[PDB]
C-alpha cells in the first residue's frame, strides 16, 4: 500500500471571545458567539475520524471568514482592523511536543489554524491511503487532498507569515523553512500515488523512472531544507525522508534499467539494476533504525514491495540478451561507479492546488464593528490536548 510519516496535530487553548463592556449590542454580541462555536466546531473535527473534506471545507470557511474581521476591514482591502491585537492565542507545534507558544495577533491565530487544516488534509489522505482496498476513485481523493494541502501551506508561507509582527522561532511550524518542507513533502507524497498508479496501468518505463527520480529529488530538497534545525526534534522525520528519497531512487535505477536493455545497452543496464538493488537494500537499512530513532509522530511500517516482482522480470529478461556479454553470474566489464541520472518527468508532476481564504464575513458591518467599543475594555484555561490515537 502507501505509507507516509505524520507529525502530530497542533493543539490550542479554548478561546471564548468574551468581552464585556466592550461588546455593546445584538450584532456584535452575536458574532462573538459565532466565533466561539465555529472555532470549536472546527477543533472537534481534527480529532474526529468521521470527517470528509467537504465537511471540513465548510467548517473552515465559516471560521476563517468570521476570523477575517479581526485582521482586515470590509471598507478598504488595504487597511487593517482595530481588533487584530485584541485576543491572545496559544498553540503547540508539531515538532515541539507539549510546549505552547502564544501571540496576541489574529494573524498568528489564522496562520496556525489554517496550518492545522492543511495538516488535517494530509492526515486524511494518509489514513485513507493505508487501506488495501484502494479504489481508482478513492485515489483521486488522496491525491487531490495532498494538493489542497500543498496549496494551503504555500499560501500561508509566502502570503501570510510576512505579516506576523514578531519573527518566528527556529523549529516552530510558523517558520518558513519548516513550511517549505511540508509543501514539498506533500507534492512528493502525491507523486508517490501517481507512480503507484502509473505502474499499475503499465505506462512506459521511461515515464515511471523520471517520475520516481524527480520524487527522490523532493525528499532530497526537504532534507536539505529541514537540515537547518537542531537534530533533537527533526531526527526521526529527516531519517524517514532520507529513507524515502532512497527507496524511490531505487525505483529510478530499476525502471531506468528497462530503458537500457530495451535500448540494447547492457553493461549499464546491469550496473543500474544492481544500483537499484544495492539501494533497496540500504533503504530497508534506513527503515529499520528510523524505527529506532526517536521523534514526534507514529512509526509507519513501509508496506508495498512489488519492487522485487519488478526487478525479477528485468533481471530475468536482462540476462537473456546479455548472457553472451557481461555475465552470466560473473560480470565484466561492469562500470565501477553508478550511472548518473539527470531526468525530468513530463507527466505526473504535482502543482499545489492554489488556495485563498474566504473573504471576510458579511456579518461584519461598520455598525457591527463599531459595536465593539475598545474604549470600554477594563487568569487562563490551558491547551486542551489532542489525544490522537
Amino acid at each position: 500500500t502507501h505509507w507516509f510519516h505524520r507529525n502530530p496535530l497542533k493543539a490550542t487553548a479554548p478561546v471564548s471571545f468574551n468581552y464585556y463592556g466592550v461588546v455593546t449590542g445584538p450584532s456584535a454580541s452575536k458574532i462573538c458567539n459565532d466565533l466561539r462555536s465555529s472555532r470549536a466546531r472546527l477543533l472537534e473535527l481534527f480529532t474526529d475520524l468521521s470527517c470528509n473534506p467537504e465537511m471540513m471545507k465548510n467548517a473552515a470557511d465559516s471560521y476563517f471568514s468570521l476570523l477575517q474581521g479581526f485582521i482586515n476591514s470590509l471598507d478598504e482591502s488595504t487597511q487593517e482592523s482595530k481588533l487584530r491585537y485584541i485576543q491572545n492565542f496559544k498553540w503547540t507545534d508539531t515538532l515541539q511536543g507539549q510546549v505552547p507558544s502564544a501571540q496576541q495577533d489574529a494573524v498568528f491565530e489564522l496562520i496556525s489554524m489554517g496550518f492545522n487544516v492543511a495538516l488535517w488534509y494530509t492526515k486524511y489522505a494518509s489514513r485513507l491511503a493505508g487501506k488495501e482496498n484502494i479504489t481508482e476513485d478513492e485515489a483521486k481523493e488522496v491525491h487531490r487532498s495532498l494538493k489542497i494541502a500543498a496549496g494551503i501551506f504555500k499560501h500561508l508561507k509566502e502570503s501570510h507569515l510576512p505579516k506576523l509582527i514578531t519573527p518566528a522561532e527556529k523549529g516552530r511550524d510558523l517558520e518558513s523553512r519548516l513550511i517549505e518542507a511540508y509543501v514539498i513533502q506533500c507534492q512528493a507524497e502525491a507523486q508517490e500515488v501517481t507512480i503507484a498508479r502509473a505502474i499499475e496501468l503499465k505506462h512506459a518505463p521511461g515515464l515511471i523512472a523520471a517520475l520516481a527520480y524527480e520524487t527522490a529529488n523532493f525528499y532530497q530538497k526537504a532534507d536539505h531544507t529541514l537540515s537547518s534545525l537542531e537534530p533533537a526534534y527533526s531526527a526521526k522525520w529527516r531519517k524517514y525522508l532520507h529513507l524515502k528519497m532512497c527507496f524511490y531512487t531505487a525505483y529510478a535505477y530499476c525502471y531506468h534499467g528497462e530503458t537500457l536493455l530495451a535500448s540494447d545497452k547492457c553493461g549499464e543496464a546491469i550496473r543500474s539494476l544492481q544500483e537499484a538493488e544495492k539501494l533497496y537494500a540500504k533503504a530497508e537499512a534506513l527503515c529499520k533504525e528510523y524505527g529506532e530513532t526517536k521523534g514526534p509522530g507514529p512509526t509507519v511500517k513501509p508496506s508495498g514491495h512489488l519492487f522485487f516482482r519488478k526487478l525479477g522480470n528485468l533481471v530475468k529478461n536482462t540476462l537473456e540478451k546479455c548472457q553472451r556479454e557481461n555475465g552470466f553470474i560473473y560480470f565484466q566489464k561492469i562500470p565501477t561507479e553508478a550511472p548518473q541520472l539527470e531526468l525530468k518527468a513530463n507527466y505526473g508532476l504535482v502543482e499545489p492546488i492554489p488556495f485563498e481564504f474566504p473573504p471576510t464575513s458579511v456579518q461584519w458591518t461598520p455598525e457591527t464593528l463599531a459595536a465593539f467599543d475598545l474604549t470600554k475594555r477594563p487568569t487562563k484555561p490551558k491547551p486542551e490536548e489532542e489525544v490522537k490515537p
Binding site: 485515489a139 483521486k140 491525491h143 500515488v193 501517481t194 498508479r197 502509473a198 496501468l201 505506462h203 515515464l207 513530463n346 507527466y347 505526473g348 508532476l349 504535482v350
Partner: peptide
Amino acid sequence: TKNKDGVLVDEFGLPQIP
C-alpha cells in the same frame, strides 16, 4: 482534458491510453 503540449491526460496528470 489535455495538457500544455496538447496531450490527452489522465486526471492524475498522466498520459491516457488503452
